[PDB]
Symmetry: C3
Subunit: 320 residues, 3 copies
C-alpha cells in the first residue's frame, strides 16, 4: 500500500532461507505489496525478490515456472532474467522486448539464515545479532506465526514485561510475584533499549533480561541465568496494517539436546501472546493521543517509550 | 454502529435472560453497536454488572478474564475492577492507588420479568408494563432467543402486520381460504401505539400495545384461555436483531411444549420473510427500489411508521 | 448498477431456455439488478423477466408461486398477471388495486435456445448467429461458468490469441510453436472483428494430422462473441455470451455448433471445458480486477503487436462510453 519512509527504507524478514530451494518459487506479502521469491537450479544460486506482477496483462509471476536462469510468466510466456528484465516475448521471438517490459525488483539479503527484503532505498543496516558465528552457541528457528494484529501491536506486546505473571503463568512468570521492579528505558540513536530487569521463574529460577530494537519491528532479546545464556532475534513481517508474521531465531550456549524443549517453550508463550493480540481493540496501535484513551502506569515505561519513538520516527502505518 | 437517537439510547433493552447469568459467570452481548460484558460475583443474590467489554489499560475484552471474589480481573495484566467498575488493584504496583481513569464504562441494569434490561444512556422512560407478571393465575415460559438478520424496526413492523397470517402462517394463525381482513382500529397517542381488536376467520381475538417502539405487549383471548406475551427486540446494530418472547397464559401448565412449538413454527415462518426483505432498513413515510404501497389493512404498520418519524428515529430506518 | 446506456439499453443472456420449464420460477442477476424469471404452466407460455421485488413490503417475488397465469407473492398473496399488473389483493378482494401495484418488468426474448433480457430501452438487436438455422450443423451447450472477474476482463481473454500455446498447451497450441502470425483487426459499424488467424495445433475433435486451424470472430455487442474455427476437415462456430452480474463477477456460456458427426459432441464439450477452465485460472488472478482502458501503484499495461485485438477492444469500449467494470 503506502507505508511510511522509515518502514519502506528498512529491511524486513519475509522467509527462511530453507523455504527457498533451488529452482523453487514462493510468495510473501510486505507492507501491502505482493512478492515473488525465486531461485534458479544452480548450486548456491541467489534469491530474487520481485513484486508478484507481470506488467503485460497483470498476472502473478508466481504462477509461472523457473526455466534455466529465468522466471516465465504462465499467460503469454514472457521470460524475465535474474535482473528482472524481459529477455523474450515468444509471440514475437525476434522482437527486442520493450524497455518497459521488466519486473519491479527489490533488494534482498540472506543473513542469519533469513531472507531480508528492502522495498525502498536501504539506508539502514540489517540489525546485528552478535551470537550468530559464536561456536559456543547452537541455533534453532521457530515456525512462522501468522497473527491477525497490527505489527506495531505485536511488537508492543513483545516489549511489555508486566504481563508475564498472568498470560505466561508458570512459563515466564509467577502468579505469586506480580510486582514489577523499576527498570530503565532509553530511546536514542541505537533505537530503544530496555535495561536489565529481573523476574523470578523456572523454565534455577533467576533470569536477567534486556533487549534492544534498532528497528521498530525487530527485537534482539538476551536472557541470562547463571547456568546458561539464551538470545533471540524476533522479526515481525508487516503484511499490511492489520496482519503480521512473527518469526524467532533462538541461540543458546547450553547443551544442543535442549533444542526440542526450547521450541516447545517458545511455541507455548507465543500462542499465549497471540490469544491476547487477536482480541485487542482497536487493532492498530494507538499513539499517545468511542473507546477510552490508553492508561499508563510506571511499569509501562518501555511501552510508553515505544509509542513515543514511533511518533518521533513518523510512523502512521498500522497505528492510530 | 451506534446511535444518538434518544428514544433508543435513553431507553431500556433486554440483552439476556436472568437464567443465563449464574453467579460467578461471565457472558457477552451486543446492544446498539456496543459490546457488553455481563458478570456476577459468586455470592448468592449478587447483582448483575453490565459494562462495555473493554479494559482501558491496553484494550483487551474484560470478558476474557475471570471473576475473583467481588471483582472482574482482566487476563492481560490482572487489573481488578470492583462491582462499581473502579479498578481497585494493579498487581505490578501493589501499593499504588490506581489512576482515577482506571475505571470500567458502566451501564444501568435492571432485572425485571426474569429478563436483564440495560439502558446505555439516561434512563428517562420506565421499563414497559406487563400486568400479568404479578397474576398468580398465569404460568410463564420463555422462548429461546432468535438472532435475525434484519433491522429491529423491520422485525417490529412484521409483528404489527396482521394481513400476512393466511399466507406464511397458513394452518397456524390464518387459513388460506379466508384471506379478507376485516376493519380494525389503531391509535397513536401519549401511551404509544395501540391496535384494537381483530380476529381471523378459520375453518381467537387479539390486540396489542407498544409504549416502547421495540417492545410489544400482545393479548390473545379465546373462550378457553387467555395468552399474553411481551415480545422484546434487542437492536444489535442497524441490521441485526435478537427477538425474545415472554409468554404467559392461564390455562393448563402442560400446554407449554405445544405453545413453544407453535411460537417456534410461526417465528421461523416470519424470519424467512424478514431475512429476504429489501431494503433491510424499514422505510418511513413520504420520503433503486420503489416506495412502499399501503392498503387499508396496513393501517397499523402505517401508523407505526408515522410514530417512528414523530419520535425522531433515524437508526435502522430509511 | 450502471448508467452506461450501451449496457442498460442492450440485450444480455441470463438463462438457457431449457432451465425455464412451464410453471417454473428461477432467478438471475444482471448489472446489479436481481431478476425473477417465470412461466405459466400452459404449453408454450412466454417467459416473464421482472425485478425480483414486491412493491408492497419488499419481498422477493421469486420466493412465491405460479398460479394459473399469475405470480403470487408469498407474504400477503398479491397476484401479478403476465404483464406485471397486480390483479388481486387478497386482503381487499373487491378493491381496485392502485396503479402503483405493479411489478417492474423488463423486455425478454428467446433466441438460440437462450433467454435474452434488456433492462432499458433496446436500441441494439440481439447479436446474429447464422449457423443456428443451418441443418448441416449439430449443436451443444456448455454448462455455465461463474467467474470472479470483470465481464470486460473475461471478454478480453477471449479476444486474446497469443496465450494459446501456453495456458492451452496441448489443446489449442503447442509449446514448440509460440510465434503468432500477423492478422488484422477492425473496429467499425460491425463492431470489433478479428480477421482470419492461422495457428498450429492438433485438436481432440479431429484427425491426428489435421493440425492447421484458422480462427475468426466478430463482436457487435461488447459482451457477446461469434467465433468461427475452421480446418480443411471441419468447421466449428460458437456464440459466447458473458452475463455481467456486477462490475466484478460474470457468467460465461458457450453455444457450440459444428458441421460434422453428432458423435463428436462429448469430445467437443471436453475440449471447451478443459480450455475454459485453463482461462479461468488466469482470469481469477489478474489485477486490477477491472479492465484497464488505454491511457498514454501498479505499472501500466504493455502492448505488443499480437495484442492488436485486445488493444482495439479497450479502444472500442471507451468510444462506446463504458465506465462499468473498466479501469
Ligand atoms: N515468546 C517469548 N519468549 C520470551 C523470550 C525471552 O528472551 C529470551 N532471550 O529468552 N524471547 C523474547 N523475544 N521475548 C520478548 C517478549 C518475551 C519473549 N517472548
Ligand atoms: N409469532 C407470533 N405469534 C403471535 C403471538 C400473539 O399470540 C398471543 N397469544 O399473544 N405473539 C406475538 N407477539 N404476536 C404479534 C403478532 C402475531 C404474534 N407473532
Ligand atoms: N475456451 C475457449 N475455447 C475457444 C473456442 C474456439 O477457439 C479455438 N481456438 O478453436 N471458442 C471461443 N470463442 N474462443 C475464444 C478464445 C479461444 C476460445 N476460448
Ligand atoms: S500477462 Fe505475463 S506474459 Fe502476458
Ligand atoms: S489490558 Fe487489562 S490489565 Fe492490561
Ligand atoms: S410484500 Fe408482497 S404481497 Fe405484501
Ligand atoms: Fe508475552
Ligand atoms: Fe407473522
Ligand atoms: Fe483461452
Amino acid at each position: 500500500t503506502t507505508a511510511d519512509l522509515i518502514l519502506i527504507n528498512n529491511w524486513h524478514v519475509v522467509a527462511n532461507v530453507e523455504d527457498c530451494k533451488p529452482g523453487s518459487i514462493t510468495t510473501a506479502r510486505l507492507l501491502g505489496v505482493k512478492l515473488v521469491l525465486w531461485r534458479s537450479q544452480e548450486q548456491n544460486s541467489p534469491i530474487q525478490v520481485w513484486q508478484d506482477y507481470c506488467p503485460h496483462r497483470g498476472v502473478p509471476l508466481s504462477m509461472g515456472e523457473v526455466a534455466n536462469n529465468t522466471l516465465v510468466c504462465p499467460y503469454h510466456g514472457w521470460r524475465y532474467n535474474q535482473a528482472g528484465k524481459c529477455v523474450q516475448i515468444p509471440a514475437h521471438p525476434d522482437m527486442v522486448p520493450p524497455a518497459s517490459a521488466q519486473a519491479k525488483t527489490y533488494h534482498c539479503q540472506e543473513r542469519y539464515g533469513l531472507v531480508w527484503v528492502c522495498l525502498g532505498n536501504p539506508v539502514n543496516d540489517i540489525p546485528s545479532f552478535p551470537e550468530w558465528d559464536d561456536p559456543n552457541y547452537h541455533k534453532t528457528y521457530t515456525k512462522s506465526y501468522l497473527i491477525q494484529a497490527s505489527p506495531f501491536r505485536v511488537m508492543d506486546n513483545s516489549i511489555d514485561v508486566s504481563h508475564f505473571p498472568f498470560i505466561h503463568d508458570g512459563w515466564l512468570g509467577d502468579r505469586n510475584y506480580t510486582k514489577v521492579e523499576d527498570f530503565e528505558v532509553k530511546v536514542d540513536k541505537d533505537g530503544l533499549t530496555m535495561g536489565k530487569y529481573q523476574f523470578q521463574t523456572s523454565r534455577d529460577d533467576s533470569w536477567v533480561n534486556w533487549f534492544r530494537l534498532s528497528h521498530p519491528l525487530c527485537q534482539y532479546c538476551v536472557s541470562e541465568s547463571p547456568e546458561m545464556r539464551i538470545v533471540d532475534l524476533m522479526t515481525i513481517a508487516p503484511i499490511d496494517e492489520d496482519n503480521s508474521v512473527l518469526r524467532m531465531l533462538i541461540m543458546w550456549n547450553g547443551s544442543e539436546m535442549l533444542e526440542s524443549k526450547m521450541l516447545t517453550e517458545y511455541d507455548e508463550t507465543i500462542e499465549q501472546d497471540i490469544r491476547i493480540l487477536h482480541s485487542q481493540q482497536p487493532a492498530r496501535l494507538p499513539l499517545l493521543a468511542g473507546l477510552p484513551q490508553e492508561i499508563h502506569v510506571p511499569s509501562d515505561r518501555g511501552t510508553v517509550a515505544y509509542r513515543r519513538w514511533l511518533k518521533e520516527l513518523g510512523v502512521t502505518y498500522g497505528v492510530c
